[PDB]
């Protein structure tokens, strides 16, 4: 194992370890949109851009490995100028749903604007809207709220099995939908709503019932379907309405059962 | 020290009369058996000793790029990749290197086959240029059947098979990572460049990306002496590259010219509109679409070489002249260049899909004159940002020409905003 | 006079101090505070630079109502400055600004 | 429209080429033998040439021959610009409007063609003979105007020469390359 | 910075002299930890002797505090030692604010 | 601009202006406002439970400020006197929607509120 | 009724109402939720 110092502090990492994976050992979380837990490593956003000690261009954390003993700073001058910029590009074509939107506090993009992005102003005029994609029982999908990334695209191809989500256009018109009018299969694809960072894919059964603000969470193993453990259930006064998958090491691979999610 | 234009020297001269056997009399496959008998290390050294720059719009040297793969030990069989499709607008190299002389392009794959160590060679052509693609397919039938390349030909142990594939006609032929993904079968989107280049993994194989003009120069450099290619040009950049002039001109024509050549001498030979740089206002771009437009004051000092072009504003990479007259609009012309990137944006990196589309919408307002005088300075900060935080080189290609509006100009942009402010408001 | 809070020492202040610690002289100074308080209010009317009302940085104060309805980042910050608090820097701080009764030593 | 697909009268009915089926199988052999998805990019271009206006069900049948995902193969033709989306006539021509062509007037060639061959710009002919569409770049930028019809691209045309070539194309093919001046150097 | 920064550090090095001066005596009985941030000084004190620390700062030739005015306490269950009684002290002659803390569980 | 008894406003062409966010719920320093939301018939999703306690509520205008749609607008109110707590604490909208008698003044007062004073 | 006119929207009440007080036809609290359903049938 080769050791390379990140933010002056030295941390030992594997030879084929990612930059964001190396950052976790130093106890620092970079701004993410494309996963690092179970979903395959892919670019297609350039948010997790980090500047090296002696480099003209910033490298993405998901793709570029550490390899050689090179210094990388998380709270650098170039990184903060990058992070504020990319956030503005994400929100130049964003439909503005925040009070109506199913997520609110649970939304990863909502937090990153508060934590990293530029606050005072955002230069934008005229945003494009996408037509609503067809969906069956679970997840009332809205294509407008989607940021057009690669998270749910690879989820159907690798984690779920049956592929449906992909690319539809080229510019700021490419939709994450199925293109052909067909309802999504069950199996384990009910967990796709929990995967997406934006408030685009969210469960239709418990839609707009309770916000992320004011909800008491408790972890409990699911009774329906065997080998199910660690599932957070929000109380939100009297009766529980929303049940989300809790992180587990061996019992479950961060995905709830389709029968248990509804 | 000074470079002379052509003077009975060209990489590809046959354009009027060439088919299959007619090209052979006028320098084609002269040392085909000699290059095949020579070792892979000695053949690769010939390109490195000459010091030839990359013909494609990047700036990277061709000698270092071919030697980057090398292949010491390989599990998966290696494959050769070549791009022939038109990427940047204003380039005439796509319908000249393959359309006029198809025998020269096919010989380039055979010369680089034994050097790199590839089992099969692949070429990508434009979907819109179907007539030019038919000439390349006809040359492959005259080479494989007769005995030029395939299994065992011209006294060679290494086998190489040539196959041409029709492209979609977008950014898939643009980026080096994009060509590997397009040929594989997946959607037109480039792979992540930071961790693995073409050598580490491309379509499940070690590969190398090469331009149509870059691959065609390889058999010419191998047959002739190494000093002949390095004779014309500068110390840093050497080798003759095909330059094409398009737009406001007396006669639009593509002609081969030597490196480190002045812009005033090249425009005078092809004959431009009104004047070379006295009566008509200079708005010519050194690159096809990548490089921003050169100023009226600095044009005579600018050279065709990439090393000399980097000193003033931005370096020429595509090498194509896009001259505009004084009567022609400047604001509307550059806005159309960004609109090209609006359609040729692939849909991956977020400061490009929702970036260039945001950039074009603001730029369309400058033609009308509804934009504020303060909005000019704000747009410059955004334009610089796209250049750094993108995976492929097309993100840079849309970023550079917008930077050439704030630089050099500015009173031309302010006059359009001031005119609509008094007339309408 | 000793510790400025928000633009002090620039405004002319008069502090009444007596001699005897009885209830009458402790009452006289309060009336002398009242007669020498309009001087500050008049100087507040004299010096008023037109500009911002809230902090321009939208991580502390919510943006304008006309601003939030059109632009994107403004409404997301409006959504997070309300419900969720401020995200404060950690540390113990003590401040005391002169109350007419005494002090408000917030810790 | 790019994402949405109509279900009425163009969703179930589809036909595949029988005579060119042997030629399509040989095209798959040109690439790698094991794990071949490259044939899907080649068959999509072959389907448009054989049958006019590609159907949604026809792409699913083409994906079944190579054995690939139906959603992934449908998305592969969505990114491409050369492939037909809805409907195309007997001879469809696309005009270039980019800055290397716009500098020596390109909009004048499109406006003259719009009045001679009818319709605005996006709308096609009602009798189905010629369809007009805005193109990014034709490829060859040697001539000041460029327009690619069916397969062969016609370059270099005047205000009256473009209208004369369009009306003649209704009955007999007009060939041509750059009918205004020398091809290489002038 | 114009609106982003509250005040530039200038008296921070001057207040750091107090962080050395009391620490120059160096008692394990008294001193322990000295923290200085945002124009303020913080000292925590060993439980065995709190009165000898409070007799100091009272009177004294170098610095005259006298007023040991406001008195707070912190409840925190993270540490093995629970409560943290915090003294807020103010000087009239010197014009400075210093802090005295206790580290013991004090059940 | 004066804060009294709470009343929720609506659009000029029917439709309840309150969108159900729980935004005003969390800002409320008294926790007087409660909100539980369900989908309205088909398509639209606007409220079901909406109780504001007058036993609580210290009157801030915070719920007026936190509201992005401007539903709760504080009208010039003084008249409120009851026999019981039950009569005093506001029910599921209804009595809040009955603020139509004050909404004519609210519409006039909000015209002095956009671009503040 | 002289200079500034009241805005019409057809949502506001046409006839003005007096205070609720301790008199009949006054203010009242009401339940909102449909609650958790439970049913048993032969
Ligand atoms: C907008 C843009 C378009 C490009 N288009 C092409 C192209 O069509 N063909 C090509 O060979 N190179 C093209 N390039 C250059 C690529 O970067 C190329 O893959 C490689 O890096 C250059 O090396 P080569 O000369 O050995 O091909 C393009 C670059 C940019 C920025
Ligand atoms: S996706 Fe997130 S940031 Fe966007 S409107 Fe919904 S909650 Fe707000
Ligand atoms: S729906 Fe969500 S996960 Fe899928 S592409 Fe859009 S933002 Fe990414
Ligand atoms: S920069 Fe633009 S065109 Fe290039 S890979 Fe990223 S999104 Fe695609
Ligand atoms: S009053 Fe306003 S903030 Fe509160 S739930 Fe209704 S719309 Fe949302
Ligand atoms: S005025 Fe204040 S206390 Fe009353 S409901 Fe609104 S936020 Fe709550
Ligand atoms: S978060 Fe790393 S590329 Fe998107
Ligand atoms: S720019 Fe018009 S043909 Fe290339």
Q: Which residue has the tokens 């806005």?
A: B335
Calculate ∠ Cα C72-C77-C82, nearest 5°.
135
Residue B251: other Cβ atoms inside 10 A:
12
- Overall size of chain B counted in residues: 425
Strand partners, A244: A232
> Nearest by CB to A99, which of F25, F39, F69?
F69
> From CA A44, how far away is CA A61, in angstroms rounded?
12
R_g of chain B computed on alpha carbons: 22
Strands, DSSP E only, in C25-96?
none
> D179: buried, middle or exposed (CB in 10 Å: 19+, 13-18, 0-12)?
middle
Give the torsion sign (CA, A100, A102, A106, A109).
negative
- What CA dihedral angle connects B143, B146, B152 and B156, to 10 degrees? -70
The whole-angstrom distance between A121's CA and the closest CA on chain B is: 12
The closest of B165, A34, F65 to D46, measured between CA atoms, is: B165
Q: Atom 2 in ligand 3: which residue has the minimum CA distance?
A: A196
> From CA B388, how far away is CA B399, in angstroms rounded?
9
Question: Rounded to 5, what percent of chain A is helix, strand, coil?
Answer: 20, 10, 70
> From CA C86, how far away is CA C82, in angstroms rounded?
9
Strand partners, B163: B122
> From CA B375, how far away is CA A125, in angstroms rounded?
12
Residue A149: other Cβ atoms inside 10 A:
23
Nearest CA in chain F to A214: F26
> A44: buried, middle or exposed (CB in 10 Å: 19+, 13-18, 0-12)?
buried
> C22: buried, middle or exposed (CB in 10 Å: 19+, 13-18, 0-12)?
exposed
Sorted by where each starts, the structural domains of chain B and their CATH numbers stand as 46-224 (3.40.50.11540), 240-324 (3.10.20.600), 330-424 (1.20.1440.230)
Is residue A23 a known part of a binding site? Answer: no
> From CA D40, how far away is CA B187, in angstroms rounded?
10
The closest of A33, A94, A24, A93 to A60, measured between CA atoms, is: A33
Domain span holding position F74: 5-116
Q: Is B120 helix (H, G, I), strand (E, B) or coil?
A: strand
Residue D9: other Cβ atoms inside 10 A:
7
Q: Is B126 on the interface with D (CB under 8 A)?
A: yes
> From CA E29, how far away is CA E42, in angstroms rounded?
17
Q: Check if B353 has its Cβ closer than 6 Å to any atom of ligand 4.
A: yes
Residue G37: other Cβ atoms inside 10 A:
5
Strand partners, B207: B79
Q: Which chains touch B (3 or more CB pairs under 8 A)?
A: A, D
Tokens linked to B24: 């052979």
Alpha-helical runs (H) found in A97-145: 108-115
Q: Which residue has the tokens 């002379």?
A: B4
Who's near B321: CB < 8 A, 6+ residues apart? B90, B243, B244, B245, B246, B247, B263, B266, B267, B284, B285, B286
> From CA C71, how far away is CA D136, in angstroms rounded?
32
Cβ separation of G33 and F49 shorter than 8 Å? yes
R_g of chain C computed on alpha carbons: 21
> From CA G27, how far away is CA G19, in angstroms rounded?
10
Residues of chain D with Cβ-Cβ distance to B326 below 8 Å are none
> From CA B34, how far away is CA B155, in angstroms rounded?
9
Cβ separation of B163 and D31 shorter than 8 Å? yes
Nearest CA in chain B to D63: B185
Q: Using the CB atoms, write b or e for B29-63: b if 16+ within 10 Å.
A: beebeebbebeeeebbbbbeebbbbbbbbbbebbb
Q: Which residues line ligand 7 (CB under 6 A)?
A: A 32-34, 43, 45-48, 60-62
For every residue of B326-392, DSSP letters joined together read SSS-SHHHHHHHHHHHHHS--S-SHHHHTTHHHHHHHHTHHHHT-S-TTHHHHHHHHHHHHHHS-SS
Residue A155: other Cβ atoms inside 10 A:
23
Cβ separation of A123 and B382 shorter than 8 Å? yes
> From CA D116, how far away is CA D111, in angstroms rounded?
9
- HSE-CB of C88 using CA atoms within 13 angstroms: 5
Residue A254: other Cβ atoms inside 10 A:
18
Tokens linked to B84: 């022939």
Q: How far is the CA of B172 from the centre of ligand 4 (A)?
A: 10
Q: Is C55 on the interface with A (CB under 8 A)?
A: no
> B190: buried, middle or exposed (CB in 10 Å: 19+, 13-18, 0-12)?
buried
Q: Which residues line ligand 6 (CB under 6 A)?
A: F 27-30, 32-33, 52, 57-63
Calculate ∠ Cα C76-C82-C84, nearest 5°.
95
> From CA B86, how far away is CA B133, in angstroms rounded?
12
Residue among B395, B396, B397 to mutate when testing ligand 4 (max atoms within 8 A of CB): B395
Mutate to test the interface with A, among C72, C82, C86, C87 (most CBs of A within 10 A): C72
Who's near G1: CB < 8 A, 6+ residues apart? none
Atom of ligand 6 nearest to the CA of F74: 1
> From CA E61, how far away is CA E69, in angstroms rounded?
20
> From CA B264, how far away is CA B299, in angstroms rounded?
7
> From CA A52, how far away is CA A58, in angstroms rounded?
7
Q: Is C6 on the interface with E (CB under 8 A)?
A: no
Q: Is A94 on the interface with C (CB under 8 A)?
A: yes
Q: How far is the CA of A147 from the centre of ligand 3 (A)?
A: 6
Q: Is C79 helix (H, G, I), strand (E, B) or coil?
A: helix
Cβ separation of F48 and G33 shorter than 8 Å? yes
> From CA D175, how far away is CA D169, in angstroms rounded?
9
Cβ separation of B168 and D100 shorter than 8 Å? no
Strand partners, E86: E72, E101
The closest of B349, C62, D30, B207 to F68, measured between CA atoms, is: C62
Residues of chain F with Cβ-Cβ distance to G26 below 8 Å are 87
> From CA B309, how far away is CA B400, in angstroms rounded?
14
> From CA B184, how far away is CA B79, in angstroms rounded?
12
> B244: buried, middle or exposed (CB in 10 Å: 19+, 13-18, 0-12)?
buried
Which approach determined this entry? cryo-EM
> From CA A258, how far away is CA A244, in angstroms rounded?
11
- What CA dihedral angle connects D172, D176, D181 and D184, to 10 degrees? -170
* Contact between B313 and B294 (Cβ < 8 Å): yes
Q: Is E44 helix (H, G, I), strand (E, B) or coil?
A: strand
Q: Which ligand is nearest to the CA of C72?
A: 2
Q: How far is the CA of D138 from the centre of ligand 8 (A)?
A: 5
* Contact between B127 and D148 (Cβ < 8 Å): no
User: In this structure, what CATH number is given to the domain that contains residue F17?
Assistant: 3.30.70.3270
For every residue of F70-113, DSSP letters joined together read --B----------SSHHHHS--SSTTTGGGHHHHHHHHHHGGGT
Residues of chain E with Cβ-Cβ distance to C52 below 8 Å are 3
Give the torsion sign (CA, B351, B356, B359, B361).
negative
Q: Check if B190 has its Cβ closer than 6 Å to any atom of ligand 4.
A: yes
Long-range Cβ pairs for the range F46-50 (8 Å, 24+): F46/F16, F46/F18, F46/F19, F46/F20, F47/F16, F47/F18, F47/F20, F47/F93, F48/F92, F48/G32, F48/G33, F49/F92, F49/G32, F49/G33, F50/F8, F50/F18, F50/F92, F50/F93, F50/F96, F50/G32
What single DSSP character describes residue A219? Answer: E
Q: Is A229 helix (H, G, I), strand (E, B) or coil?
A: coil
The closest of A63, B323, B185, A45 to D43, measured between CA atoms, is: B185
The closest of F90, A77, A166, C70 to D69, measured between CA atoms, is: A166
Tokens linked to A181: 């009018």
End-to-end CA, chain E:
48
Phi/psi of residue B379, each to 5°? -65, -30
Q: Which chains touch A (3 or more CB pairs under 8 A)?
A: B, C, D, F
Q: Is C2 on the interface with E (CB under 8 A)?
A: yes
Strand partners, B164: B123
Total count of domains within chain F: 1
Cβ separation of A169 and D78 shorter than 8 Å? yes
Q: How far is the CA of A46 from the centre of ligand 7 (A)?
A: 5
Residue E14: other Cβ atoms inside 10 A:
11
Is residue D186 a known part of a binding site? Answer: no
Strand partners, F8: F72
Residue B414: other Cβ atoms inside 10 A:
12
> From CA C61, how far away is CA B75, in angstroms rounded?
61
Tokens linked to A153: 């695209």
* Contact between B185 and D28 (Cβ < 8 Å): no
Q: Is G37 on the interface with F (CB under 8 A)?
A: no
Cβ separation of C79 and A110 shorter than 8 Å? yes
> From CA B258, how far away is CA B256, in angstroms rounded?
7
Calculate ∠ Cα E80-E82-E87, nearest 5°.
130
Give the torsion sign (CA, B71, B76, B82, B87).
negative
Q: What residues of C are designated binding site for [4Fe-4S] cluster?
A: 23, 29, 44
> From CA F27, how far away is CA C55, in angstroms rounded?
20
> From CA F29, how far away is CA F59, in angstroms rounded?
9
> From CA E96, how far away is CA E88, in angstroms rounded?
11
> Nearest by CB to A59, which of B194, B361, B385?
B194
* Contact between B231 and B45 (Cβ < 8 Å): no
């Amino acid at each position: 194992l080769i050791e390379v110092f990140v933010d002056g502090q030295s941390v030992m990492v594997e030879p084929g370890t990612t930059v964001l994976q190396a950052c976790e050992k130093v106890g620092m979380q970079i701004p993410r949109f494309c996963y690092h837990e179970r979903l395959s490593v892919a670019g297609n956003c350039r948010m997790c851009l980090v500047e090296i000690e002696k480099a003209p261009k910033v490298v993405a954390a998901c793709a570029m490995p550490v390899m050689k003993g090179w210094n990388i700073l998380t709270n650098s001058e170039k990184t903060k100028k990058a992070r504020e910029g990319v956030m503005e590009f994400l929100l130049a074509n964003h439909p503005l749903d925040c009070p109506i939107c199913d997520q609110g506090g649970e939304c990863d993009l909502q937090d990153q604007s508060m934590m990293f992005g530029s606050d005072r102003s955002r230069f934008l005029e005229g945003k494009r809207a996408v037509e609503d994609k067809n969906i069956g029982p679970l997840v009332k999908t809205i294509m407008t709220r989607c940021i057009q990334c690669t998270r749910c695209i690879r989820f159907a191809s690798e984690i779920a099995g049956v592929d449906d989500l992909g690319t539809t256009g080229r510019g700021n018109d490419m939709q994450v939908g199925t293109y052909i009018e067909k309802m999504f299969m069950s199996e384990l694809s009910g967990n796709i709503i929990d995967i997406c960072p934006v408030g685009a894919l969210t469960x239709x059964x418990x839609x707009x019932x309770x916000x992320x603000x004011x909800x008491x969470x408790x972890x409990x193993x699911x009774x329906x379907x065997x080998x199910x453990x660690x599932x957070x259930x929000x109380x939100x006064x009297x009766x529980x309405x929303x049940x989300x998958x809790x992180x587990x090491x061996x019992x479950x691979x961060x995905x709830x059962x389709x029968x248990x999610x509804x | 020290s000074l470079k002379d234009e052509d003077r009975i020297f060209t990489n590809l001269y046959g354009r009027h009369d060439w088919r299959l056997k007619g090209a052979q009399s006028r320098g084609d496959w002269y040392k085909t058996k000699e290059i095949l008998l020579k070792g892979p290390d000695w053949i690769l050294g010939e390109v490195k000793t000459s010091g030839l720059r990359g013909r494609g719009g990047a700036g990277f040297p061709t000698g270092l790029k071919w030697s980057f793969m090398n292949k010491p030990s390989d599990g998966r069989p290696k494959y050769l990749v070549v791009n022939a499709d038109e990427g940047e607008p204003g380039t005439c190299k796509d319908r000249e290197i393959i359309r006029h002389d198809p025998h020269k392009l096919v010989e380039g794959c055979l010369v680089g086959g034994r050097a790199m160590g590839a089992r099969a060679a692949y070429i990508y052509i434009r979907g819109e240029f179907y007539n030019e693609a038919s000439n390349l397919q006809v040359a492959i039938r005259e080479a494989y059947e007769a005995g030029l390349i395939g299994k065992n030909a011209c006294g060679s142990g290494y086998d190489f098979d040539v196959f041409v594939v029709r492209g979609a006609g977008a950014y898939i032929c643009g980026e080096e990572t994009a060509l590997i993904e397009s040929i594989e079968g997946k959607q037109g989107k480039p792979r992540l460049k930071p961790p693995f280049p073409a050598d580490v993994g491309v379509f499940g194989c070690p590969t190398t990306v090469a331009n149509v003009e870059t691959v065609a120069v390889s058999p010419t450099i191998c047959r002739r002496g190494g000093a002949w290619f390095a004779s014309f040009g500068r110390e840093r950049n050497s080798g003759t590259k095909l330059f094409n002039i398009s737009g406001h001109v007396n006669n639009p024509c593509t002609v081969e010219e030597e490196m480190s050549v002045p812009l005033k001498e090249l425009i005078e030979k092809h004959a431009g509109g009104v004047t070379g740089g006295w009566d008509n206002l200079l708005a010519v771009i050194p690159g096809g679409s990548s490089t921003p437009l050169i100023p009226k004051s600095v044009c005579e000092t600018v050279l065709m070489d990439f090393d000399a072009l980097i000193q003033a504003q931005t370096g020429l990479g595509t090498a194509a002249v896009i001259v505009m007259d004084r009567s022609t609009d400047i604001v509307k012309a550059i806005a159309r260049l960004i609109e090209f990137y609006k359609h040729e944006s692939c849909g991956q990196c977020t400061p490009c899909r929702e970036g260039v589309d945001w950039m074009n919408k603001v730029m369309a307002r400058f033609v009308r004159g509804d934009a504020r005088p303060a909005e000019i300075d704000s747009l410059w900060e955004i334009s610089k940002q796209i250049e750094g935080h993108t995976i492929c080189a097309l993100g840079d290609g849309a970023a550079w020409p917008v930077q050439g509006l704030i630089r050099h100009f500015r009173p031309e942009l302010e006059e359009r905003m001031q005119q609509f402010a008094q007339q309408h408001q | 006079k000793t510790q400025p809070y928000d633009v002090y020492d620039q405004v002319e202040f008069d502090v009444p101090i007596g001699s005897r610690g009885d209830c009458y002289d402790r009452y006289l100074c309060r009336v002398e505070e009242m007669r020498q308080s309009i001087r500050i209010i008049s100087q507040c009317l004299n010096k008023m630079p037109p500009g911002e009302i809230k902090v321009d940085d939208a991580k502390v104060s919510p943006p304008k109502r006309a601003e939030m309805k059109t632009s994107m980042e403004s409404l997301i910050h409006h959504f997070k400055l309300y419900t969720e608090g401020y995200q404060v820097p950690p540390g113990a701080t003590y401040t005391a600004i002169e109350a007419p009764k005494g002090e408000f030593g917030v810790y | 429209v790019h994402r949405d697909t109509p279900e009425n009268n163009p969703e179930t009915p589809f036909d595949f080429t029988p005579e060119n089926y042997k030629r399509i199988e040989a095209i798959v052999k040109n690439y790698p033998e094991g794990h071949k998805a490259a044939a899907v990019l080649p068959v999509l271009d072959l389907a448009q040439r054989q049958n006019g206006w590609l159907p949604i069900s026809a792409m699913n049948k083409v994906a079944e021959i190579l054995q690939v995902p139906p959603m992934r193969v449908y998305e592969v033709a969505t990114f491409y610009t050369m492939y037909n989306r809805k409907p195309v006539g007997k001879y469809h021509i696309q005009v270039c409007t980019t800055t290397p062509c716009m500098l020596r007037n390109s909009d004048s060639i499109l406006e003259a063609i719009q009045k001679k061959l009818g319709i605005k710009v996006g709308e096609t002919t009602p009798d189905k003979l010629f369809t007009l569409i805005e193109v990014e770049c034709l490829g060859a930028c040697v001539n000041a105007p460029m327009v690619q019809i069916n397969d062969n691209y016609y370059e270099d045309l005047t205000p009256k020469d473009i209208e004369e070539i369009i009306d003649e194309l209704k009955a007999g093919k007009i060939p041509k390359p750059g009918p205004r001046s020398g091809r290489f150097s002038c | 910075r114009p609106t982003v920064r509250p005040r530039n550090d200038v008296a921070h090095k001057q207040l750091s002299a107090f962080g050395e001066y009391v620490a120059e005596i160096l008692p394990k009985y008294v001193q322990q930890v000295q923290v200085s941030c945002f124009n303020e000084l913080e000292i925590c004190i060993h439980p065995d002797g709190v009165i000898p620390v409070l007799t100091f700062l009272r009177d004294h030739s170098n610095a005259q505090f006298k007023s040991l005015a406001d008195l707070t306490a912190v409840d925190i269950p993270t540490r093995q030692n629970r409560f943290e009684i915090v003294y807020n002290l103010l000087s009239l002659r010197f014009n400075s604010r210093i802090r005295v803390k206790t580290y013991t569980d004090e059940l | 601009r004066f804060r009294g008894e709470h009343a929720l406003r609506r659009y000029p062409s029917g439709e309840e202006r309150c969108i159900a966010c729980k935004l005003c719920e969390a800002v409320c320093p008294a926790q007087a406002i409660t909100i539980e939301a369900e989908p309205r018939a088909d398509g639209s999703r606007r409220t079901t439970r909406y109780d504001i306690d007058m036993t609580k509520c210290i009157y801030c205008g915070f719920c007026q400020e936190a509201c992005p749609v401007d539903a709760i607008v504080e009208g010039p109110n003084f008249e409120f006197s009851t026999e019981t707590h039950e009569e005093l604490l506001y029910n599921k909208e209804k009595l809040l929607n009955n603020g139509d008698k004050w909404e004519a003044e609210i519409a006039a007062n909000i015209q002095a509120d956009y671009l503040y004073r | 009724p002289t200079v500034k006119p009241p805005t019409a929207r057809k949502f506001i009440w046409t006839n003005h109402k007096f205070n609720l007080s301790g008199t009949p036809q006054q203010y009242v609290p009401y339940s909102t939720t449909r609650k958790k359903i439970q049913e048993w049938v032969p």
